[PDB]
């Protein structure tokens, strides 16, 4: 494709690696760095005007980097690994206060991701696909950018057509995540301001940016 | 947007 | 093309969707009542309640839908509620002018107006057809990573029977963009943030309560 | 109840 499938799998592989919620954000930052770092090795993402570029990347944030987590954390039972190295599971994040949101993770995201055993050539497109977000405000040129989604969606389902042949309905089930992610994406966002106005938990310089 | 627009510059 | 199975299941929701009738008394008042912000909204929640009853209805005739438990029925039609009424609002306005003048005087936070009309925007240019809306509306109310629901799994079974359907039909009524089906899924997950953010509309819309049924539906 | 009306609405069946 104009979204080569093997150009979104070397970006992810490219970028491998006391209180749940203050570990959670200081692996958010660290992570921020290196998203920054995954855009640039999207097909385009680069060749966009910055002002867009910034501004996808300002809308995608937060999806971008549950969804990667997330798929890091397949391995793991009832629980999260952050980039960091550290677990946090199922009873840290209730016993913190933040657990509704935690089992909406693992039971949405985390098993599921489990369960049809999806690929980073997969995680990858989805990422890609969030990245590209051609209704986010104040954007340049929407059209460039649900453009480039749409080889984007042209892409993943060549590939899951030539992969995965014996399971015609992967190539949705696979974007079916997406508005799930959208709702876990922004109740975080949610907790993550109401964190920020009340003051309990530190948050790092690149994280509080992406909070204003 | 500092940080941001500061490393998504290179080249 | 589609099996003999998935014709029938299409022509069943079908006549279910076309069953959806607003009364003529409620779109009487379209013209005849005058123009205030205070009138704009007694009309639309007067429409929003009838349209609730509406959806509960065709939301009972969809397959295996009485089969889930009786508390999960309910985490199913609060947690889709909106979504569907902003599919169905869509169809409208690209099928009026009076309606949108409405909503947009009926005291309603300005930060919330330009979005909802750009999302009617970005539907009407996937050029849908009144299959593909009854598709996307049933598939948005079989969403099984709503709030509260139990059997997950059981809402799952029901809705995936649907997602085959409607990406046959999209590839038979919309060969010349195959991405088409995509694109219907990509609305799926832009359905979310106007889900998100209704709870705020409603309590900072502007007013001298809203019905019961609403009132249920959406929490007080 | 709490969900009076939508009880009583999915307790009535086909048309
Ligand atoms: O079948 C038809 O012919 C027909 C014709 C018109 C029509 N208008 C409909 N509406 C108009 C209105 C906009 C779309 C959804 C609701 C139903 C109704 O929502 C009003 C609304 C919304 C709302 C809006 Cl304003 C836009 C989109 C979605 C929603 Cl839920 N939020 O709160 C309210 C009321 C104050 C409680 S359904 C319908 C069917
Ligand atoms: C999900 C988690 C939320 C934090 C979220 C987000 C949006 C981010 C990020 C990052 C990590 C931790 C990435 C990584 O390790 O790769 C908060 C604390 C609001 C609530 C508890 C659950």
């Known amino acids: ?212 | 947007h500092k940080i941001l627009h500061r490393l998504l510059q290179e080249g | 093309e589609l099996t003999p199975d998935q014709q029938t299941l299409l022509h069943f929701i079908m006549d279910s969707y076309n069953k959806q009738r607003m009364p003529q008394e409620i779109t009487n008042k379209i013209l005849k009542e005058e123009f205030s912000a205070e009138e704009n909204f007694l009309i639309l929640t007067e429409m929003a309640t009838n349209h609730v009853q509406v959806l509960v209805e065709f939301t009972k005739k969809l397959p295996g839908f009485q089969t889930l438990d009786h508390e999960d029925q309910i985490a199913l039609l609060k947690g889709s509620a909106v979504e569907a009424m902003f599919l169905r609002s869509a169809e409208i306005f690209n099928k009026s002018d009076l309606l949108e003048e409405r909503i947009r005087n009926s005291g309603i936070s300005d930060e919330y107006i330009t979005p909802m009309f750009s999302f009617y925007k970005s539907i009407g240019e996937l050029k849908m057809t009144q299959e593909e809306y009854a598709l996307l509306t049933a598939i948005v109310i079989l969403s099984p990573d709503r709030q509260y629901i139990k059997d997950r799994e059981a809402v799952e079974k029901l809705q995936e029977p649907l997602l085959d359907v409607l990406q046959k039909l999209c590839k038979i009524h919309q060969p010349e963009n195959p991405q088409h089906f995509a694109e219907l899924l990509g609305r799926l997950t832009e359905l979310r943030t106007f889900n998100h953010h209704h709870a705020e509309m409603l309590m900072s819309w502007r007013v001298n309560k809203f019905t019961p049924l609403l009132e249920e539906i959406w929490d007080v």
């Open chain 1, 1 to 212: 494709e104009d979204m080569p499938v093997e150009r979104i799998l070397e970006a992810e592989l490219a970028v491998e690696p006391n209180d749940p919620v203050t570990n959670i954000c200081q692996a958010a930052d660290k992570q921020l760095f290196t998203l920054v770092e995954w855009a640039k090795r999207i097909p385009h993402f680069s060749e966009l005007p910055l002002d867009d570029q910034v501004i996808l990347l300002r809308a995608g944030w937060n999806e971008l980097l549950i969804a990667s987590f997330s798929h890091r954390s397949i391995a793991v039972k009832d629980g999260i690994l952050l980039a960091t190295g550290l677990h946090v599971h199922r009873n840290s994040a209730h016993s913190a206060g933040v657990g509704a949101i935690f089992d909406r993770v693992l039971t949405e995201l985390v098993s599921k991701m489990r369960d049809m055993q999806m690929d980073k050539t997969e995680l990858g497109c989805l990422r890609a696909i969030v990245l590209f977000n051609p209704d986010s405000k104040g954007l340049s040129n929407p059209a460039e950018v649900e453009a480039l989604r749409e080889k984007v969606y042209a892409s993943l389902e060549a590939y899951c057509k030539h992969k995965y042949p014996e399971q015609p309905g992967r190539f949705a089930k696979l974007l079916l995540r997406l508005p799930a992610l959208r709702s876990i994406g922004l109740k975080c966002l949610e907790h993550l301001f109401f964190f920020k106005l009340i003051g309990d938990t530190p948050i790092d310089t690149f994280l509080m940016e992406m909070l204003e």
